[PDB]
Amino acid sequence: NMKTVTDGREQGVVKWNQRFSEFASYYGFIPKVCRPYRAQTKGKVERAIQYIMDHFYVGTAF
DNA sequence: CCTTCTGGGGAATTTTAAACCGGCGATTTTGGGGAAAAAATAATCGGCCTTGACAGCTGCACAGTAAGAGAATTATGCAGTGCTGCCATAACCATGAGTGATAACACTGCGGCCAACT
Numbered sequence: 578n579m580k581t582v583t584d585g586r587e588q589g590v591v592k593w594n595q596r597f598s599e600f601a602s603y604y605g606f607i608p609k610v611c612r613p614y615r616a617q618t619k620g621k622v623e624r625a626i627q628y629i630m631d632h633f634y635v636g637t638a639f
Numbered sequence: 640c641c642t643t644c645t646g647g648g649g650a651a652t653t654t655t656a657a658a659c660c661g662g663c664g665a666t667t668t669t670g671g672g673g674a675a676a677a678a679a680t681a682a683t684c685g686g687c688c689t690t691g692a693c694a695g696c697t698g699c700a701c702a703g704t705a706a707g708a709g710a711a712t713t714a715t716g717c718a719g720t721g722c723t724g725c726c727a728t729a730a731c732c733a734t735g736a737g738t739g740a741t742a743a744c745a746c747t748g749c750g751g752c753c754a755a756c757t
Contacts, residue, residue: 627693
């Protein structure tokens with residue numbers, strides 16, 4: 578639930594940001610939002626974040 | 640009435656069984672050397688089992704003590720100036736010794752001149 582993709586739960590239903598909704602309709606992909614304060618529903622990407630931040634960005638210097 | 644037979648006992652002798660001690664023949668044991676095998680120890684390999692973390696981030700508040708940073712104040716050491724006295728150095732002359740110089744020959748460095756290529 579990022580404000581760059583939504584604008585709050587209008588009584589349970591989600592209100593999509595108009596510009597982002599236009600962007601999604603342009604590329605055709607349907608957006609979805611998991612839920613407030615529940616990151617389990619997107620465990621794949623969070624675990625990938627753990628993977629990258631404990632494998633790549635641990636000692637690499639730039 | 641007498642003679643002969645037999646039996647018991649003490650002494651001498653012989654044989655066989657048992658036990659010890661020694662000698663002789665055999666196996667065992669100890670030591671050293673060489674080879675082979677087993678096991679022990681360490682290191683390296685693969686893989687299974689299980690769980691932590693990834694989910695915005697951490698800066699601030701209070702407690703006490705100590706340190707330190709900045710500014711004002713104070714102490715002290717350097718410097719400056721005047722007057723007098725003492726020590727150093729410098730100036731001259733003489734004599735000895737060292738080095739810079741001068742002559743001569745030989746080798747090398749630099750400038751003037753000639754030629755070859757583009």
